[PDB]
Structures are given as C-alpha cells and as structure tokens.
C-alpha cells in the first residue's frame, strides 16, 4: 500500500475552506476488531484489521489497536481512548469498529451489545471537549440486521 | 459568545444499510474495508473524505456475492455515510513533504 501525497499547490488552494488538518500526527486512530465469538468466526477480519492499521498509519495517524473485546471492555476502552490528552494537540480523530452487529449496535465477543449512540456520545462536544470543532471519523464494519439483499434486475 | 450543539463535526461510514447484512470474504476481507482502503489510498491526496465515501458507495453498489449453493450467491450490499461535517475534510497526506 502507498498513499500518494497531496501537492503543495493543492494544500494552498484548499486549506482555507477545509477543517484545519496539519498536525503531526494528524490524529489518533483506534482500530477495534472482534473476530472470535460464541455469531460465527469472522473469517477475513484479520485482513480488514491489518489493512486499516496500515492505511491509517500511512495517512499520518498514531494507531491504537484492540482485538476481541467484550461489550463492557469496548465501552471502557473507547472512553479511555476519547479521554486521551493527545486529542488537544491533534487536528482530527478516527475510530474504526469491526464486529458483528445489529441496527444501531455492535457485539462484544461475549454476545452482548454496545449501542452506537453510546459510542458517539463519548466523542461529542460535551464529553470530549479536546475534540470540539475537529473532524471525527467513524467507520463501522458490522451487519445492521439479518436481511440478505437478493438484488434486483435493472430495467 | 458562540456555543456548540452537543454533537457536531462527525462523519460515520457504514458498511451496509439499516436492516441489512454487510458482506465479507474469507480471503479478501469485508467488501467495505477493501473498497475504503483502495479509495483512500488513491484519492486522499485530492479528494475530501465525504467525496471518497461516495466513491466507496459506487464500488459496493457494483459488487456481488460469490457463494454458489447458498442464499448469498449473487447477493448485494449498499454502503452509506451520515455527516454532521461543517466543512470539507481533506486529509492533506504527506504535506509538508
């Protein structure tokens, strides 16, 4: 994997109308993957995890990793992560969650659910003042229901 | 003085739509992460994050399941993103050099 750098000219012509994003590191990133459960084994989840860790590193993030956590461990550790002092001096934040899920929630390795509303709240303007006015990216690799999409014919 | 809503300046990319399943391959991993890494690595230099997530949506819309003899053969997935962003989000990778 390689990330093409932006040009000095691109930066000069775009930085005034974008979020400030020049800190080094650009932000902290968390990649939390649950692969072993009770909820079948998530074959290929190891490839996903490795890919994101590599990507976020190449995008200039300091990457934190967690694997196979219970719902309670996820909540506690996401909160620890949101409360880290580094957020005051970085310009953005990334959180990637990869597991089984249902609409609005994701599973811990114990088959218990963590609500995504609870996750986002940890990073909000009230609970995470260090990230106020800074862009916060979330990527959620999880099912949101058990309905398989059969697809439809194009008319 | 200017105050803030309780929640703002977030973007959330989801692998699938409400009510549905996201797809994953044993060898290549999840369709959505595979696409996300391909687009972000190629386009972070000149495209903002919401616009890259649109390119991801294009890739996912086009893919189909390969699983002969099960309910997943030729199945589909659609990704989405939700945004309370208030500006363009450029990652400006590798600047300054």
């Amino acid at each position: 994997m390689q990330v093409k750098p932006c040009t000095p000219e691109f930066y000069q012509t775009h930085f005034q109308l974008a979020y400030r994003l020049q800190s080094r590191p650009r932000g902290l990133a968390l990649v939390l993957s649950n692969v072993h459960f009770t909820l079948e084994f998530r074959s290929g989840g190891d490839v996903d995890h490795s890919t994101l860790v590599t990507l976020f590193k190449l995008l200039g993030y300091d990457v934190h990793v967690l694997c196979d956590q219970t719902a309670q461990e996820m909540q506690e550790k996401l909160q620890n992560f949101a409360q880290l002092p580094a957020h005051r001096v970085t310009d953005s934040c990334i959180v990637a969650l990869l597991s089984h899920g249902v609409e609005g929630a994701i599973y811990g390795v114990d088959g218990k659910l963590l609500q995504l509303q609870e996750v986002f709240q940890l990073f909000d303007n009230a609970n995470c003042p260090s990230l106020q006015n800074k862009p916060k990216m979330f990527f959620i690799q999880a099912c949101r229901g058990d309905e398989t999409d059969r697809g439809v014919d194009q008319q | 003085k200017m105050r803030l809503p309780t929640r703002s300046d977030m973007i959330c990319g989801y692998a699938c739509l409400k009510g549905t399943a996201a797809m994953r391959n044993a060898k290549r991993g999840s369709w959505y992460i595979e696409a996300l890494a391909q687009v972000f690595s190629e386009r972070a230099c000149d495209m903002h994050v919401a616009d890259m997530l649109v390119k991801v949506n294009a890739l996912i819309k086009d893919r189909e399941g390969y699983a002969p003899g099960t309910e997943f053969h030729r199945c589909k997935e659609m990704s989405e993103y939700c945004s309370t962003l208030c500006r363009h989000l450029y990652l400006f990778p590798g600047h300054p050099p």
Binding site: G101, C143 | A21, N25, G65, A67, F72
Partner: peptide, 5 residues
C-alpha cells in the same frame, strides 16, 4: 466465499 457480517 462471501458470508454475512
């Protein structure tokens, strides 16, 4: 083969 997350 492709499977459900």
């Amino acid at each position: 083969v492709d499977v459900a997350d």
